[PDB]
Amino acid sequence: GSMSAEGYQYRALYDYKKEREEDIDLHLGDILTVNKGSLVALGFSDGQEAKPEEIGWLNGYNETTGERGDFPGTYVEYIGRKKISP
């Protein structure tokens, strides 16, 4: 209805394979989505949500594969956000 994303999004940069049961399979064009106003999803309290370069592990889900797990903040690229960061 709002005609917008249901949280913050990221875009995969390179194909990564999962080596841990805690991680999931990552491919190209695969966009990840997180929460919208509960950054405590990660236990974070900065409010940055834009420079994965310093962020360690991000937890989200890949709608394309309906999968859910954790991924590093170096193989993806922050792209889009809700109005929580003017």
Domain positions in the chain are: 1-86
Look up residue 21 and give its DSSP letter. Answer: T
Q: Residue 8: name the closest of 56, 41, 53 by CA.
A: 41
Which class does domain 1-86 fall in? mainly beta
* Structural method: NMR
Q: How far apart are CA 9 and CA 20, in angstroms?
A: 23
| CA distance readout (Å), 11 to 1, 26, 43, 45 | 23, 11, 22, 23
Q: Three-class SS of residue 26?
A: strand
| CA distance readout (Å), 67 to 16, 28, 47, 61, 75 | 14, 15, 25, 6, 17
Sequence-distant (≥ 6) Cβ neighbours of residue 65 within 8 angstroms: 24, 25, 30
Q: How far apart are CA 34 and CA 7, in angstroms?
A: 6
